[PDB]
Amino acid sequence: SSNDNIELVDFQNIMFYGDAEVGDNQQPFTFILDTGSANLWVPSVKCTTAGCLTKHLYDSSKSRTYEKDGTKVEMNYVSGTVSGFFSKDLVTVGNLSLPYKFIEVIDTNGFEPTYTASTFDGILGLGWKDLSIGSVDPIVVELKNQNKIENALFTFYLPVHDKHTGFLTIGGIEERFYEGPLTYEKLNHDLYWQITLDAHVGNISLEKANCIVDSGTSAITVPTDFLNKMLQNLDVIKVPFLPFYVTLCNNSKLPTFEFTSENGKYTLEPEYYLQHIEDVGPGLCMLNIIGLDFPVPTFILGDPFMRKYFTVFDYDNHSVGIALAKKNL
Ligand SMILES: Nc1nc2cc(-c3ccccc3)ccc2c(=O)n1C[C@H]1CC[C@@H](c2ccccc2)O1
């Protein structure tokens, strides 16, 4: 392989992980690879909460290439807060290495229970510079600037549960990962990997909707107005009193998403947004679709989309490449 590949492992068909190294001695970490954020978050040995004790921790004291930064990072949420500081050190992705400014995480006081139960260590962003904290050039951008890769692009071939493993490839596109035509959609903004597509479900239509391609989202996000109209008489029921949608797995009235442009047509069948829940009932499935409303009519194409479609992320050409992922390698 003339390109840099990192193997992707599936986690119960809801999320996937990838491993990368931090430090001179190449300390290994399990990462969530996220195109919806743009920073590298690594837990520190200076993190002493219960959850952190069970994680792989970055010890800057055991790395020759560690360069002190110290710039405080405190990201606040309700639920909770993520505290830390910036650090610079050698980041190894596959067989490539470069000095990189990342965030050393000291405190995760909100997410302590879920983090513990989680099987990942940190988060590796794959968005754009303007999406990052502290104006940090994306790893792939930085790598090409350093003449370490052919092209400023990375590609996602996601793993399928119980079927096959996946790969993150940096620097080049490999034909083995996809079938059918490979079509490009130019970004409408250099922030998220967001493109402009027309969405169609049955006769329900929405045109020139902002579509964000995001590997950090387990579901498919749809405008609430769009969701209610598409689930009209399809033998699909809302849970009381929550926004959960349940249906029979064999529901023949289940529609297919259709995202079209001037260059390509992208469809997502029921087999891609249905999650089996045989616990509650025989032949019962849940719709992995969330009704979410942004100021602009926006779809979020999370894992269920990328699970079907091999994707290309081009910084140089400011575009997203989309093609039918091969079902077997
Ligand atoms: N992919 C992703 N990654 C995140 C990572 C973080 C995060 C939190 C702590 C440390 C590092 C990253 C927070 C939120 C998101 C988060 O919301 N997303 C989802 C993407 C899809 C849409 C976009 C977005 C845009 C506006 C409002 C809410 C969400 O973010």
TrEMBL record:
<protein>
    <submittedName>
        <fullName>Plasmepsin-2</fullName>
    </submittedName>
</protein>
<feature type="disulfide bond">
    <location>
        <begin position="249"/>
        <end position="285"/>
    </location>
</feature>
<keyword id="KW-1133">Transmembrane helix</keyword>
<dbReference type="GO" id="GO:0020020">
    <property type="term" value="C:food vacuole"/>
</dbReference>
<keyword id="KW-0378">Hydrolase</keyword>
<feature type="domain" description="Peptidase A1">
    <location>
        <begin position="16"/>
        <end position="323"/>
    </location>
</feature>
<comment type="similarity">
    <text>Belongs to the peptidase A1 family.</text>
</comment>
<keyword id="KW-1015">Disulfide bond</keyword>
<dbReference type="GO" id="GO:0005775">
    <property type="term" value="C:vacuolar lumen"/>
</dbReference>
<feature type="active site">
    <location>
        <position position="34"/>
    </location>
</feature>
<dbReference type="GO" id="GO:0004190">
    <property type="term" value="F:aspartic-type endopeptidase activity"/>
</dbReference>
<keyword id="KW-0812">Transmembrane</keyword>
<dbReference type="GO" id="GO:0016020">
    <property type="term" value="C:membrane"/>
</dbReference>
<keyword id="KW-0645">Protease</keyword>
<keyword id="KW-0472">Membrane</keyword>
<feature type="disulfide bond">
    <location>
        <begin position="47"/>
        <end position="52"/>
    </location>
</feature>
<dbReference type="GO" id="GO:0006508">
    <property type="term" value="P:proteolysis"/>
</dbReference>
<keyword id="KW-0064">Aspartyl protease</keyword>
<feature type="active site">
    <location>
        <position position="214"/>
    </location>
</feature>
<keyword id="KW-0926">Vacuole</keyword>
<keyword id="KW-0735">Signal-anchor</keyword>
